[PDB]
Amino acid sequence: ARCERLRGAALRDVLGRAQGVLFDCDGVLWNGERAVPGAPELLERLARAGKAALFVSNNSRRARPELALRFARLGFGGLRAEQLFSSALCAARLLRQRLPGPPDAPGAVFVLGGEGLRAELRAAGLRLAGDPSAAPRVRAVLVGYDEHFSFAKLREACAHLRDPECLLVATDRDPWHPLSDGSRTPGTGSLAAAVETASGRQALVVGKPSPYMFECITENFSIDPARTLMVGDRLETDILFGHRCGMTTVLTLTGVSRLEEAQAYLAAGQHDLVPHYYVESIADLTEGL
Amino acid sequence: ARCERLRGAALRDVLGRAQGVLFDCDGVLWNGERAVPGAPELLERLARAGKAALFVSNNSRRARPELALRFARLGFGGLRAEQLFSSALCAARLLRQRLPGPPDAPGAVFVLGGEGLRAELRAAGLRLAGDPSAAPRVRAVLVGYDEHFSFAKLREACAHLRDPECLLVATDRDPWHPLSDGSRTPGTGSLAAAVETASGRQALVVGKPSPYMFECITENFSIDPARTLMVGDRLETDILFGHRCGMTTVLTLTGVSRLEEAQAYLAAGQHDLVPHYYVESIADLTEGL
Ligand SMILES: [Mg+2]
Ligand SMILES: [Mg+2]
Numbered sequence: 001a002r003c004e005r006l007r008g009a010a011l012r013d014v015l016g017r018a019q020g021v022l023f024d025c026d027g028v029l030w031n032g033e034r035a036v037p038g039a040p041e042l043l044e045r046l047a048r049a050g051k052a053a054l055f056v057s058n059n060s061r062r063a064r065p066e067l068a069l070r071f072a073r074l075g076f077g078g079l080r081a082e083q084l085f086s087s088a089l090c091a092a093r094l095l096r097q098r099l100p101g102p103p104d105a106p107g108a109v110f111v112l113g114g115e116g117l118r119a120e121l122r123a124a125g126l127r128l129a130g131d132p133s134a135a136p137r138v139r140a141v142l143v144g145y146d147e148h149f150s151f152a153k154l155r156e157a158c159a160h161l162r163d164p165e166c167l168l169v170a171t172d173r174d175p176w177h178p179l180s181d182g183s184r185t186p187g188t189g190s191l192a193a194a195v196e197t198a199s200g201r202q203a204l205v206v207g208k209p210s211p212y213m214f215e216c217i218t219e220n221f222s223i224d225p226a227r228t229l230m231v232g233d234r235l236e237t238d239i240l241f242g243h244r245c246g247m248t249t250v251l252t253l254t255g256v257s258r259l260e261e262a263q264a265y266l267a268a269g270q271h272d273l274v275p276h277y278y279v280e281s282i283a284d285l286t287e288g289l
Numbered sequence: 290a291r292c293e294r295l296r297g298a299a300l301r302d303v304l305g306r307a308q309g310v311l312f313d314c315d316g317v318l319w320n321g322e323r324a325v326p327g328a329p330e331l332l333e334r335l336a337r338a339g340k341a342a343l344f345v346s347n348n349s350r351r352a353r354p355e356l357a358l359r360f361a362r363l364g365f366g367g368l369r370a371e372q373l374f375s376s377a378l379c380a381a382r383l384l385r386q387r388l389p390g391p392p393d394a395p396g397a398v399f400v401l402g403g404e405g406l407r408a409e410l411r412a413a414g415l416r417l418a419g420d421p422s423a424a425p426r427v428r429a430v431l432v433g434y435d436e437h438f439s440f441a442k443l444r445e446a447c448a449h450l451r452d453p454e455c456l457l458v459a460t461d462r463d464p465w466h467p468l469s470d471g472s473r474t475p476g477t478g479s480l481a482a483a484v485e486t487a488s489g490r491q492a493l494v495v496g497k498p499s500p501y502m503f504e505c506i507t508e509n510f511s512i513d514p515a516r517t518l519m520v521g522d523r524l525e526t527d528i529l530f531g532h533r534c535g536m537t538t539v540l541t542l543t544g545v546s547r548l549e550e551a552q553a554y555l556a557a558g559q560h561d562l563v564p565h566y567y568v569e570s571i572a573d574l575t576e577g578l
Contacts, residue, residue, distance in 0.1 A: 149440040154475045158465065162473070175486045176447065184451070186443045186487035193482040197464045198475035 027255020038283025316544020327572025402433030
């Protein structure tokens, strides 16, 4: 990984070789309400050229059917729900897999998060602490994007975690997210930091840069990481994810991370946070096909 | 610091030499509603023998007049309010001292914390973001023990901190606190972790183990740290504070930290988290006088 500007012959060969492309969404395909011009067209040409496209998002705020809506709304047609992987969806699968209880009863998840996250969990067959009883033992605390996080919920989370057998899981560690108006919103990472600190515990992280998301993806699809491009705007999330999975990484500059940070990490020899290539926007990739 | 059990001749000499004793409160003088038997009597004998006594607490939940009440209620008479130093009181003084604005207007503090913390801040002459206007620029965010912490307040805190000139201050970093029933409550450290993570900033910490508390104390009283005992139940807070200040440190076992953790740190050569001495309870100190 030497942070090279991807163009000309090298672009045609890298894309030529590529069997598939995994895309982050926010900062890559769009910023809020606005699609990156040329992004829908890249996805079209990818379909026409080979070449698998899958989407990997740390979003834990909406269930998959609703996250899928953003694609159509922002002018990305022809996409199937099964191409989209979110930390919400993957958290539900991890909990189902890891679940410490006796076989019935495995049992309940205390969730810090919203209705879309809850809907995903229930759909994976998971029992939630907030739900109507027929009170089950809580065997996992899940920290997701919780716009209604409170000291009270934090305190309750810690009560459950006093049981060392109770799992602590976080959907992702993203510290904050940019909004259209130039402001930020705190991210799950900030809520996970509070929970870990007060409980004295380290969370299992579901989303990027955890390799679990790639396991979650490869459950459903055969992807050869050596032949797959990982495209993202956040070095510490998307690019680190790519290196950990053995993918060729492409930083796009339409999002959170700056070229200057990528080059800084290169100089400090922190090669897992350096992309193989960068582009100003993913529209620069299309001419490679 | 070699974690020695303080008794016999050594106890008489250490206490004999000591000009003063600084005490942590919770886990030392009392646990919740219950005074440590013998604790009021040690303080009495200290008065009779020399020998200054001062109290250093990370509490940011109640203003000093109300924190003083706990002493009388738990059977500690003869104490003056001026002997008590809390992170709340010291945070107010630090803000007054550090305050980045033009001279009027220095200006407003956004507070994550309760009415007792707010009352201390106003009493130091500080203007608070929540208060009635005659909207002032926020020039500091203060994170204290906030039982009404919320995602919304976290988000607002981060908005203020987008201004790199806006200070970030935390009353303390205590991660959690034990309660009488055996449960925990999250501490300011957990709330500070959320704020730091979402804002990408490091807080200035007011309370122990920050040496600022000792500066705050020495403003008012001449203490020679080389002749002062620091007595506490929490290694990472009280004992580390003591070493940083050049005091002789005494771990009491009636609180949070265990002898086993002290001895573990000794073996790992982490000498700043090892007390000079320990006692089962501070009642074991009285026979030294
Ligand atoms: Mg992104
Ligand atoms: Mg204590």
